[PDB]
Amino acid sequence: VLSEGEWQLVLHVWAKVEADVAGHGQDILIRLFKSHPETLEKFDRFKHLKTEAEMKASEDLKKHGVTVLTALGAILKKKGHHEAELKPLAQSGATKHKIPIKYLEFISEAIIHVLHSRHPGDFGADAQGAMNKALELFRKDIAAKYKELGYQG
Ligand code: HEM
Structure with a gap:
């Protein structure tokens, strides 16, 4: 679905993310909880954290961010051939959370928000478009897997 040029733009900006996986993960999760507070209720160990400073000081939250980005990064590198990782x-x-x-x-x-905020020069129109297509592919393929497992989420 994505051309070779589009994958290269995705992997280019991702290399920037890997320069500070921990930091990007924190900003992404914090942004997630603020823009959509309901998502926070999915994390039990994550609500005695009332402020941004507390979320950033939480090693538990930081660890989770790296776990999340690391998994996503491995998938993006497969350029669509991610059934095994997905x-x-x-x-x-679909079964645990x-x-x-x-x-x-x-x-x-x-993710798109944080990438643009931290890497303007390396995340322009063309790059934003590519990442959007990559993430849409990811969501489409995981939704199909969800259904095979019996989850219509
Ligand atoms: C970019 C997409 C995502 C990736 C790659 C990802 C990846 C992971 C991985 C690798 C784990 C550890 C294994 C596991 O427990 O299944 C995990 C755990 C978890 N994730 Fe997902 N995740 C993503 C999105 C989300 C979203 C959007 C939510 C909720 C709003 C979420 C909520 C959770 C929760 C609650 C856990 C369990 C954690 C613990 O107690 O340490 N994740 N995720």
Whole structure:
């Protein structure tokens, strides 16, 4: 679905993310919870954290951000050939945490927001478009996996 040129733009900006996975993960999750407070209720250990400073000081939250971005990054690098990497994620969001595609859209929005805020020069129109297509592919394929497992989220 994505051309070679589009994948290169995606992997180019992702390399920037890998310069500080922890920091990007924190900003993305914090942005997620603020723009969509309902998503926070999915994390039990994450609500005695009332302020942005507390969320950033939380090593638990930081660890989770890296776990999330690391998994997404591995998938993006497969350039569409991610069935093997996607299967495990589908099981988690469909059998263990019940994460609807709508929430994946929310977090995709947070990802785009943080990428543009931290890397303007390397995340212009063409790059934003590519990332959007990559994340849409990801959400489409995981939704199909969700259904195979019996989850219509
Ligand atoms: C970019 C998409 C995402 C990726 C790649 C991802 C990846 C992961 C991975 C690798 C884990 C650890 C294994 C597991 O428990 O299944 C995890 C856990 C979890 N994720 Fe997902 N995730 C994503 C999006 C989301 C969203 C949007 C939510 C909710 C609003 C969410 C909520 C959770 C929760 C609650 C856990 C359990 C954590 C714990 O107690 O440490 N994730 N995720």
